Amino acid sequence: IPEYVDWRQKGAVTPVKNQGSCGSCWAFSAVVTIEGIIKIRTGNLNQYSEQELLDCDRRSYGCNGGYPWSALQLVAQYGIHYRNTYPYEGVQRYCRSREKGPYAAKTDGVRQVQPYNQGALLYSIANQPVSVVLQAAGKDFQLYRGGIFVGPCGNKVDHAVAAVGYGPNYILIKNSWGTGWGENGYIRIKRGTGNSYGVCGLYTSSFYPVKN
Helix axes 25-42, 68-77, angle to 10 degrees: 50
Solving technique: X-ray
Angle at 103 between CA 44 and CA 48, to 5 degrees: 50
**Hey, what amino acid is at 85?**
T
Which of 56, 81, 175, 200 is catalytic? The answer is: 175
Residue in 162, 189, 182 with CA at minimum distance from that of residue 174: 162
Q: Resolution for this model in angstroms, one decimal place? A: 1.6
Give the active site residue among 56, 81, 153, 159. 159
- CA-based torsion, 137, 139, 143, 149: positive or negative: negative
DSSP string, 22-89: SB-HHHHHHHHHHHHHHHHHHS----B-HHHHHHH-SSS-TTB---HHHHHHHHHHT-B-BTTTS---
Active site residue 159: yes
Active-site residue, 22 included: no
Please tell me which residue in 22, 25, 56, 153 is annotated as part of the active site.
Answer: 25
Separation of alpha carbons 209 and 31, rounded Å: 10
Inter-residue contact 207 to 68 (CB < 8 Å): yes
Domain annotation for the chain: domains and CATH numbers: 1-212 (3.90.70.10)
Helix count and strand count (H, E) for the chain: 5, 8
Q: How far apart are CA 68 and CA 143, in angstroms?
A: 25
